[PDB]
Amino acid sequence: MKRKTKIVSTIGPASESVDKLVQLMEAGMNVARLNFSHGDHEEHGRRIANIREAAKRTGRTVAILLDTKGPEIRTHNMENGAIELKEGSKLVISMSEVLGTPEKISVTYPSLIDDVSVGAKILLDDGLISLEVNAVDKQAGEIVTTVLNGGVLKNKKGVNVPGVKVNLPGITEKDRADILFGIRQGIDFIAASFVRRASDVLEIRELLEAHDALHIQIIAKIENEEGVANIDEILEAADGLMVARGDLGVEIPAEEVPLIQKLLIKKSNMLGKPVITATQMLDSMQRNPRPTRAEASDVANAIFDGTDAVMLSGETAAGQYPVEAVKTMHQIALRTEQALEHRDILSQRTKESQTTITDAIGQSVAHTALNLDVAAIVTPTVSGKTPQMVAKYRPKAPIIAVTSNEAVSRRLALVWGVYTKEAPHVNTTDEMLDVAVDAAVRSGLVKHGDLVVITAGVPVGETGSTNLMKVHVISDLLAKGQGIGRKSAFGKAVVAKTAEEARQKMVDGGILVTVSTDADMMPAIEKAAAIITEEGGLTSHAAVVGLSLGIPVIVGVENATTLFKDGQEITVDGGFGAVYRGHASVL
Amino acid sequence: MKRKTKIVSTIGPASESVDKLVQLMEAGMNVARLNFSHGDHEEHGRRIANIREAAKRTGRTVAILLDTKGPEIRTHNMENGAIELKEGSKLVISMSEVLGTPEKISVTYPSLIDDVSVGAKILLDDGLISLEVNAVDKQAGEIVTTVLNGGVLKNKKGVNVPGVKVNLPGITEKDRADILFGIRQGIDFIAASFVRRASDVLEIRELLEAHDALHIQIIAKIENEEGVANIDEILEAADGLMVARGDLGVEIPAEEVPLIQKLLIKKSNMLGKPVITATQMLDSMQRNPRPTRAEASDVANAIFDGTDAVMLSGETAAGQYPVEAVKTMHQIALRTEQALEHRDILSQRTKESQTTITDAIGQSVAHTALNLDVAAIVTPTVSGKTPQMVAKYRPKAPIIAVTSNEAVSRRLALVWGVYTKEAPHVNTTDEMLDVAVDAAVRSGLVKHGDLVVITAGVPVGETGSTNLMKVHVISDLLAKGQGIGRKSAFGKAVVAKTAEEARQKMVDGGILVTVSTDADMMPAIEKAAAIITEEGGLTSHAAVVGLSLGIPVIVGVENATTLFKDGQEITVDGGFGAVYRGHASVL
Amino acid sequence: MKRKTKIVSTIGPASESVDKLVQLMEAGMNVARLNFSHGDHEEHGRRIANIREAAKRTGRTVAILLDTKGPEIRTHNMENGAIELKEGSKLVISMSEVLGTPEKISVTYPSLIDDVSVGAKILLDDGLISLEVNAVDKQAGEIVTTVLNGGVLKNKKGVNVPGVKVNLPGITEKDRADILFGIRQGIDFIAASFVRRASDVLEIRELLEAHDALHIQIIAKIENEEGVANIDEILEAADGLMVARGDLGVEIPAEEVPLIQKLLIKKSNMLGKPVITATQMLDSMQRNPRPTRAEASDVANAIFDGTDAVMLSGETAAGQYPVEAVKTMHQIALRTEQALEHRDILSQRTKESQTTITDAIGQSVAHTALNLDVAAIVTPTVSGKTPQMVAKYRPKAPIIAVTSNEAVSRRLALVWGVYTKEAPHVNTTDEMLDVAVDAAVRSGLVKHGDLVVITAGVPVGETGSTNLMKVHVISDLLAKGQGIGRKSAFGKAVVAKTAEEARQKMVDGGILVTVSTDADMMPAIEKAAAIITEEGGLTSHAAVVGLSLGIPVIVGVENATTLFKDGQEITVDGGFGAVYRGHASVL
């Protein structure tokens, strides 16, 4: 049993050491988030360096996500300290730097007055104190408002404008430096803050394209209404999504966010692109060893909603119980996951799914994995397409993605139910198949007799559509011969050359192994789950009896009575006529 | 569009006035909860009295729920003030009243030592400070423990014992007085606190039976592991359930509660018995006009889980925004409900449902209501069985329960999607049917042409199984004749006796009303959605044309050209041959 | 469109020439039946020889079926000529050769009296005249009976005994010689007449095993109640089945046969073993060019029942319109087949199917072939297992089985919807895949843009379970680049380097091929189904526009404007980023 939903942790003072990181990783951290809104390139440079060292101290794959600072409209200084503003006040905002006073403050987006409408609402201090756009002196360039939910307003607080769509083309000067730095550093992900439209995503793509770093995934962070309204084009342009519940609650009424989160997740789910649920996860855990009923409930639900990953912020960045937050986050996932209705999800995703070859194979893989209750879905992959695609169908069986590039493995560190593994790049179908079978065996997730569904796209050496599927039995072929009938059975071997041995060693459900049977062995035979004989042909006593009793029989197995020993767990395949090691309930 | 999930509000200083109550009711309060853990019979007596007066000031049906105090193990006095206890301390609990000190305190359940095991865990002060059962001196009767999550411990704090099953047979002396008082008062519900087993429920039933007040519903409150473990027998014995998330988090680890809540709700859902989600709903609203993203999220999810009702405590009992809490609670319900997957729920409930006549009719009603997209499911009822049953199938269409007893209406005030109405008790099927049709019309939920599914059990004058269903068109029969064909259509009437009128007044999709048609009217006819003629027989020009063009035609309608006027919205029923007022898309 | 149900024709005087055979084959004969109840080894030897010569004159695969004579109880001579016997008569049967007279005749199964019970029924002259077993003088060995449906009884007529189970162990002396002769001759099939139990099938198997000719399929012919009663063990032992309606009607009441035929076919269908519907097919066609409404109806229904093949007897053996019988048989199949409910059949076979790997792949193949409406299901096969298995699911798409042995091809000549083709034996998955793709192309059944589902079992060089599936697009890859978006489209190419060319050559739905787009090309762009550009990167004008208009775009296609020409039918794959020849509706 393995956790499906991935864990993303914000790195900080409480989790920047190598030993700390070594711990976060062992607790289950899949992605390390770097918040570039704070700290300098030297600090992140060292954190990054440590992630990699802890990643080696342990044999864990951890991706690096760079959360940028992004655009935002802020306020200037409030005369020496802070202003007041009551339930009224004549607060006028100037589109020019002015010393903020109870009457006139200023913002950093002179384009505001050229976007905000009358009666509109402006929020400051992350939404604490709000305003009402009374008049708009377009002339002097001063948006007149009346203080609403007043309070204390210090220097440089957040300016939020919900209703209007703000335009801040191009990436910050700062974000640009951060990005390039991230490229030099070789990060795996980039969470773009305050994405409102597809173009914000394209800008980062263009930049990555210009520095030959297209390998870097772009996660669009939704933090306002525009971003929520443009979600379709945004997802269509980005590589993933981050749902920041806290930021949303700033511009959007609380009573509306819940369905928004659920809607944003489903949309990502339908596109098969990773989605991260962030902020207000286990906040209380910065001070406490355990979370609140509420927090456990909110997290559990983000998982039922379909989130690929959950994110920790201050809980791992500065809190007092970093490793614990990851641990409970881990335990919360395992517990909720047992409640997942896999058949249903598959059915829902099949519907609402576009008619494609990749999707037809994915659905076939997902359905087969369920009906046969396979031990695993293995996916040798070039760039990770097949694994991500299969993950979309939210399979019960683990997805073992076998990459030939460590960076590709990290790309999958964020994907639901995907555990990566590396192997030499293969170019022929039989190689990819062998590599898949090998990975499954090493994974420790399969025992002889178990089944795995291997899926991938051929060519195989190239990335592309998923168009091939194979069901593969793990067990070894012990021997073969002429199989009689069409069924299969397993049980424990009972070597018996003579009737006397047959009647003394044969137990109920045993697999009789002998040279040949005859009328004197009937009693022992009527207890057998199957029969293996060295002798006989298609009409020998063992075959005839097998047909009449309806039990599998394999005839002509060379040294059957010497290569199989008492008590050996084997599977007798009547149709095809083969013996396998261990118990295989489906063949 | 109507809210489905019912709202339960705890009455208190902030909501005890008549004007206040008049407000809570208009905001959507369905049930008024009386917490008997505080206050005396005179106070509740007056609150009850006010509910009834506010209930009359408005035309609202509000049920009265009595939340009892129930059993619980408490601690005695802590020497004058309070004790300390650190991460260790030698805290010994005495099964006898002793002056609590940092070394020896006492409880009020001397049967404790005869239930608690070694290494067990005891919590005090609602779970704040916990202990570890080191030794158990069964001799001197002193359970030895070592203080764990220490803190300050004042007088008479809560003693919680999670692991062990406490036995407190019979109802408190206090609960008994409260119950009887509730009976005298004529309450509708009784929420029994700390239900652990079916027997706790039986005790209240027995008492109600002994005072001839069996009409009173018993809502079992789950607040500990035992109650969670015994949920099946408890639900099987009680009339409803209350999931108290706060209490659970005291004995049960937070990370486990979420699935417990979901499990408790589903179990109630499957039995068709009302379930209330309580505590930690909109707590922050005691101080604020709006809730938190989290709170809105938790409530929304309790609704997706299937709760019939949500409960407000301090938010309406003592908070600063009572009427607002109810209002947001109302708005949160309406919004989440739009996201309900009605077909799916029905499908799930059909499965996991016992093969009964009542359930077969309910499923048929629910499926038909969905396929025909009916305006309402009306249920004349004697004791409320049919409405509760249909509610279990969580229909999109409103359920209009028509009772002949106001107390029965209040019983349904707690049920999901059920809006009651009273009418004289009927005893014949046609009376019940007429009463149902009447209720639907008054409800304001249906317009001419809409459909309603009426369901009930006959006899009808008696309560019992649900075994009858009828689909009924609301519209009035304007006229009849020989209908031609099998289809139906509506549109606007176009009275035209002559070809000249036909060609000047006929518009696309109109319903041609004339004495008879002929070759000269063809152009107008080829624009008609249907035709009505005073003349002709089954082979007249209008009928023949109707068959060939595939449009409905009704022949032999007496004064058709004078009783129908231009622009009148009507429906022409070819099969059966009838004209109805308004547009009826299904007949 | 190809006929699915195979046609089996009895060879004779009317169809033994090479030119005749050349004709039967071109009309659609798949299997040539040799009735060994008549003729000598020299005659069949020459017929066989001719089949092979006609088979070469044409490029057709025709299997050879040897219908044996089998056991049967007959009567001896009736004194010089024939006996009478009326509605009474004292007809006593002697278990010893006696001159048949109106009073005492004899049979050739002295074991009869030791099997028949009192009041039993004996039929003679293929069922014409029946008897009633009055007394059974076990002493003198004379079964006493009273003539029932009397008539004329000549020499050596058929003795049928319906009720009792006759025992005739071992194969006839005659059948044995025929079999061996068939082996020397190298026949493909052997239809064993009058199979009553599994043991009759084993005897032929044993013999084939002893002459190293196990490759030879055994078709069990059901012709009596025992065979009908033992159908399960019989099918479990044989390789196929022959339903002889005429023979059945001899021992079984006519009103019961219809459901028996349907039951025998379904049972074979469920095991995935070929079933032949025989006798009374188009009998009237021996004298007429066309069949009767009844005959066409009976044949059509045998097809709706699920028969893999239909068989012609005298219609091709001695009749006057051999080639016509085959032709109408062919036309009747094509017409009825259009009415087949493929989805339904698949659904039925999935249910009632054993949980196996082969069946899971088959169902997946069958479902995918249906959802994607593929042009064909190709199955490279070693012994024919995969094709037979897929045929069981009765696919709409043709099954192209690619064997590396001509004898295997003939084995499949009898299987529903299977058209064989030969190719060099391959041993690697990519070879088998390539061989499959090649076969599909040569088949003439696929055009560029079509899909085929290739399925087979790996190893691949060995026969065994079916465990691999691949969906493959037929079209050629014309070029590649960075695909933008996730969709695909086709249409006709429109090469336009400048805005002026774009606005003069662009038509609705066209695929714009250019160096790069810009604001001046918008009008042409808004008509495009897709865009191909030589230039740009992921954020160029063409890509951005493609994202916003929701149409596929492929960027960076090298000589796009010179390798694609006006009017060229191509498919643009946004996701994956590739261009294909022809129109491919699914990728």
Tab-separated table of N, CA and C in Angstrom, chain A residues 121 149 245-246 249 254-259 261-262 279-281 290-294 296-298 300-301 304-305 327-328 331-332 335-336 338-339 344 348 351, chain B residues 121 149 245-246 249 254-259 261-262 279-281 290-294 296-298 300-301 304-305 327-328 331-332 335-336 338-339 344 348 351:
chain	number	residue	atom	x	y	z
A	121	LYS	N	-14.797	47.923	-5.236
A	121	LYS	CA	-14.225	47.641	-3.930
A	121	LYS	C	-12.724	47.382	-3.979
A	149	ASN	N	-14.399	48.264	5.951
A	149	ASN	CA	-13.937	47.470	7.088
A	149	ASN	C	-12.590	48.012	7.570
A	245	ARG	N	-5.913	28.542	-1.733
A	245	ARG	CA	-7.165	28.925	-1.080
A	245	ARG	C	-7.109	30.232	-0.306
A	246	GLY	N	-5.963	30.511	0.303
A	246	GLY	CA	-5.823	31.735	1.064
A	246	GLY	C	-5.942	32.969	0.193
A	249	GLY	N	-9.523	33.652	-1.091
A	249	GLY	CA	-10.383	34.253	-0.087
A	249	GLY	C	-10.189	35.749	0.086
A	254	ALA	N	-15.673	34.072	0.860
A	254	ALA	CA	-15.424	32.748	1.414
A	254	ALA	C	-16.463	31.709	0.996
A	255	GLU	N	-17.739	32.066	1.061
A	255	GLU	CA	-18.777	31.107	0.712
A	255	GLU	C	-18.725	30.603	-0.731
A	256	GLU	N	-17.900	31.227	-1.569
A	256	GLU	CA	-17.797	30.795	-2.963
A	256	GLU	C	-16.553	29.955	-3.265
A	257	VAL	N	-15.503	30.119	-2.469
A	257	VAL	CA	-14.252	29.410	-2.711
A	257	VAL	C	-14.332	27.891	-2.787
A	258	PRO	N	-14.999	27.244	-1.819
A	258	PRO	CA	-15.110	25.783	-1.830
A	258	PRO	C	-15.441	25.147	-3.185
A	259	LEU	N	-16.454	25.659	-3.874
A	259	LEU	CA	-16.800	25.090	-5.168
A	259	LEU	C	-15.757	25.463	-6.221
A	261	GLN	N	-12.481	25.703	-5.635
A	261	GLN	CA	-11.387	24.760	-5.446
A	261	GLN	C	-11.728	23.449	-6.144
A	262	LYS	N	-12.930	22.949	-5.879
A	262	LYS	CA	-13.394	21.711	-6.482
A	262	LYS	C	-13.433	21.818	-8.004
A	279	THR	N	-1.942	26.387	0.886
A	279	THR	CA	-2.306	27.310	1.961
A	279	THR	C	-3.400	26.780	2.868
A	280	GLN	N	-3.357	27.224	4.121
A	280	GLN	CA	-4.325	26.817	5.126
A	280	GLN	C	-4.526	25.305	5.123
A	281	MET	N	-3.430	24.557	5.199
A	281	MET	CA	-3.510	23.104	5.217
A	281	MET	C	-3.448	22.570	6.651
A	290	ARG	N	0.127	17.905	16.528
A	290	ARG	CA	-1.004	17.322	15.821
A	290	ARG	C	-1.866	18.428	15.242
A	291	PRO	N	-2.657	18.103	14.217
A	291	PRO	CA	-3.536	19.084	13.578
A	291	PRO	C	-4.921	19.128	14.226
A	292	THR	N	-5.778	19.995	13.700
A	292	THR	CA	-7.152	20.116	14.175
A	292	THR	C	-8.058	19.202	13.338
A	293	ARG	N	-9.207	18.842	13.902
A	293	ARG	CA	-10.205	18.007	13.224
A	293	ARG	C	-10.516	18.688	11.885
A	294	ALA	N	-10.638	20.005	11.945
A	294	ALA	CA	-10.934	20.813	10.775
A	294	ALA	C	-9.858	20.675	9.698
A	296	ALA	N	-7.606	18.359	9.312
A	296	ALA	CA	-7.536	17.001	8.789
A	296	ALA	C	-8.669	16.823	7.789
A	297	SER	N	-9.798	17.443	8.103
A	297	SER	CA	-10.990	17.379	7.275
A	297	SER	C	-10.807	18.115	5.956
A	298	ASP	N	-10.181	19.285	6.020
A	298	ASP	CA	-9.963	20.092	4.827
A	298	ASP	C	-8.992	19.384	3.894
A	300	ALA	N	-8.261	16.050	3.846
A	300	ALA	CA	-8.914	14.846	3.366
A	300	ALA	C	-9.807	15.168	2.171
A	301	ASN	N	-10.539	16.263	2.279
A	301	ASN	CA	-11.437	16.645	1.215
A	301	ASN	C	-10.762	17.126	-0.049
A	304	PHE	N	-10.230	13.972	-1.742
A	304	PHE	CA	-11.426	13.423	-2.375
A	304	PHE	C	-11.734	14.239	-3.631
A	305	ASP	N	-11.417	15.537	-3.609
A	305	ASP	CA	-11.650	16.424	-4.766
A	305	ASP	C	-10.811	16.035	-5.977
A	327	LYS	N	4.625	14.096	8.134
A	327	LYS	CA	4.158	12.795	8.603
A	327	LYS	C	2.643	12.684	8.717
A	328	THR	N	1.993	13.703	9.275
A	328	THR	CA	0.541	13.636	9.401
A	328	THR	C	-0.045	13.807	8.010
A	331	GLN	N	0.064	10.465	6.655
A	331	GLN	CA	-0.940	9.595	7.251
A	331	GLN	C	-2.346	9.960	6.824
A	332	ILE	N	-2.602	11.253	6.676
A	332	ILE	CA	-3.918	11.703	6.259
A	332	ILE	C	-4.226	11.218	4.842
A	335	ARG	N	-4.944	7.258	4.746
A	335	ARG	CA	-6.259	6.975	5.304
A	335	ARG	C	-7.414	7.351	4.371
A	336	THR	N	-7.367	8.556	3.809
A	336	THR	CA	-8.407	9.034	2.894
A	336	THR	C	-8.436	8.213	1.609
A	338	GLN	N	-7.891	5.109	1.055
A	338	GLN	CA	-8.573	3.819	1.157
A	338	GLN	C	-10.052	3.987	0.798
A	339	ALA	N	-10.578	5.194	1.000
A	339	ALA	CA	-11.984	5.504	0.718
A	339	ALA	C	-12.272	5.883	-0.731
A	344	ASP	N	-15.607	4.201	-9.996
A	344	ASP	CA	-16.366	5.402	-10.301
A	344	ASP	C	-15.536	6.466	-10.991
A	348	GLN	N	-16.019	8.151	-14.647
A	348	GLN	CA	-16.205	9.587	-14.844
A	348	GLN	C	-15.171	10.151	-15.815
A	351	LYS	N	-15.768	9.144	-19.445
A	351	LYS	CA	-16.761	10.054	-19.973
A	351	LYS	C	-15.954	11.345	-19.879
B	121	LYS	N	-5.178	5.753	28.424
B	121	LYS	CA	-5.089	7.204	28.393
B	121	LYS	C	-6.348	7.890	28.908
B	149	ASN	N	0.181	15.587	28.339
B	149	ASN	CA	0.037	16.945	27.817
B	149	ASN	C	-0.485	17.861	28.925
B	245	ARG	N	-18.810	16.744	15.766
B	245	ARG	CA	-17.383	16.670	15.450
B	245	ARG	C	-16.455	17.101	16.573
B	246	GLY	N	-16.883	18.090	17.348
B	246	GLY	CA	-16.062	18.566	18.441
B	246	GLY	C	-15.845	17.504	19.501
B	249	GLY	N	-13.501	14.636	18.399
B	249	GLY	CA	-12.096	14.998	18.447
B	249	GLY	C	-11.481	14.932	19.834
B	254	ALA	N	-7.770	13.474	15.639
B	254	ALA	CA	-8.280	14.337	14.582
B	254	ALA	C	-8.180	13.717	13.190
B	255	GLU	N	-7.036	13.125	12.869
B	255	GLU	CA	-6.867	12.550	11.543
B	255	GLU	C	-7.843	11.421	11.205
B	256	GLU	N	-8.588	10.938	12.197
B	256	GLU	CA	-9.545	9.860	11.943
B	256	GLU	C	-10.999	10.329	11.841
B	257	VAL	N	-11.316	11.461	12.458
B	257	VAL	CA	-12.687	11.959	12.470
B	257	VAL	C	-13.349	12.166	11.114
B	258	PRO	N	-12.667	12.837	10.174
B	258	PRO	CA	-13.249	13.075	8.850
B	258	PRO	C	-13.955	11.878	8.205
B	259	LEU	N	-13.309	10.718	8.187
B	259	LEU	CA	-13.944	9.553	7.589
B	259	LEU	C	-15.071	9.032	8.480
B	261	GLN	N	-17.115	10.969	10.270
B	261	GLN	CA	-18.262	11.819	9.978
B	261	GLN	C	-18.943	11.325	8.707
B	262	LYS	N	-18.142	11.115	7.668
B	262	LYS	CA	-18.650	10.634	6.395
B	262	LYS	C	-19.322	9.271	6.547
B	279	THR	N	-21.452	21.249	15.711
B	279	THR	CA	-20.235	21.831	16.278
B	279	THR	C	-19.213	22.234	15.233
B	280	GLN	N	-18.429	23.252	15.575
B	280	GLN	CA	-17.397	23.772	14.694
B	280	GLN	C	-17.930	23.987	13.281
B	281	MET	N	-19.047	24.698	13.165
B	281	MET	CA	-19.633	24.974	11.862
B	281	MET	C	-19.215	26.356	11.354
B	290	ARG	N	-19.123	37.502	8.548
B	290	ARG	CA	-18.891	36.496	7.522
B	290	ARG	C	-18.036	35.379	8.089
B	291	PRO	N	-18.096	34.198	7.471
B	291	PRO	CA	-17.313	33.047	7.924
B	291	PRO	C	-15.943	32.978	7.248
B	292	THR	N	-15.173	31.958	7.607
B	292	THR	CA	-13.860	31.726	7.012
B	292	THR	C	-14.009	30.776	5.816
B	293	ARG	N	-13.038	30.822	4.908
B	293	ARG	CA	-13.004	29.953	3.726
B	293	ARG	C	-13.124	28.510	4.235
B	294	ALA	N	-12.410	28.239	5.317
B	294	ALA	CA	-12.401	26.925	5.933
B	294	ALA	C	-13.794	26.501	6.398
B	296	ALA	N	-16.707	27.652	5.513
B	296	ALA	CA	-17.627	27.506	4.393
B	296	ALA	C	-17.356	26.162	3.733
B	297	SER	N	-16.081	25.800	3.701
B	297	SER	CA	-15.628	24.556	3.101
B	297	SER	C	-16.082	23.342	3.900
B	298	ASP	N	-15.989	23.442	5.221
B	298	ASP	CA	-16.374	22.339	6.091
B	298	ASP	C	-17.876	22.110	6.001
B	300	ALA	N	-19.947	23.075	3.466
B	300	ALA	CA	-20.239	22.608	2.123
B	300	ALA	C	-20.016	21.102	2.025
B	301	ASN	N	-18.924	20.643	2.611
B	301	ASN	CA	-18.606	19.236	2.557
B	301	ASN	C	-19.514	18.344	3.371
B	304	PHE	N	-22.164	17.754	0.979
B	304	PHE	CA	-21.832	16.776	-0.053
B	304	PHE	C	-21.853	15.380	0.569
B	305	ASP	N	-21.493	15.277	1.852
B	305	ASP	CA	-21.489	13.986	2.568
B	305	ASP	C	-22.885	13.391	2.706
B	327	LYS	N	-28.319	33.008	7.883
B	327	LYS	CA	-28.327	33.470	6.498
B	327	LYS	C	-27.192	32.908	5.651
B	328	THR	N	-25.975	32.893	6.188
B	328	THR	CA	-24.861	32.362	5.409
B	328	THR	C	-25.031	30.854	5.341
B	331	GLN	N	-27.285	30.405	2.560
B	331	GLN	CA	-26.636	30.647	1.279
B	331	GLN	C	-25.633	29.569	0.927
B	332	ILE	N	-24.934	29.061	1.933
B	332	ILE	CA	-23.955	28.014	1.698
B	332	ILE	C	-24.641	26.743	1.199
B	335	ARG	N	-25.938	27.141	-2.591
B	335	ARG	CA	-24.811	27.090	-3.513
B	335	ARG	C	-24.241	25.683	-3.706
B	336	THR	N	-24.009	24.970	-2.607
B	336	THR	CA	-23.468	23.609	-2.655
B	336	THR	C	-24.449	22.646	-3.317
B	338	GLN	N	-26.527	23.041	-5.719
B	338	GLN	CA	-26.549	23.085	-7.181
B	338	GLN	C	-25.548	22.072	-7.744
B	339	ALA	N	-24.513	21.765	-6.963
B	339	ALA	CA	-23.465	20.824	-7.371
B	339	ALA	C	-23.791	19.357	-7.108
B	344	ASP	N	-26.622	10.143	-9.732
B	344	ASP	CA	-25.665	9.292	-9.046
B	344	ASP	C	-26.143	8.849	-7.677
B	348	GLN	N	-26.822	5.111	-6.262
B	348	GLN	CA	-26.133	4.564	-5.095
B	348	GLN	C	-27.127	4.071	-4.046
B	351	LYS	N	-28.921	0.852	-5.027
B	351	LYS	CA	-28.030	-0.240	-4.698
B	351	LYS	C	-28.003	-0.057	-3.183
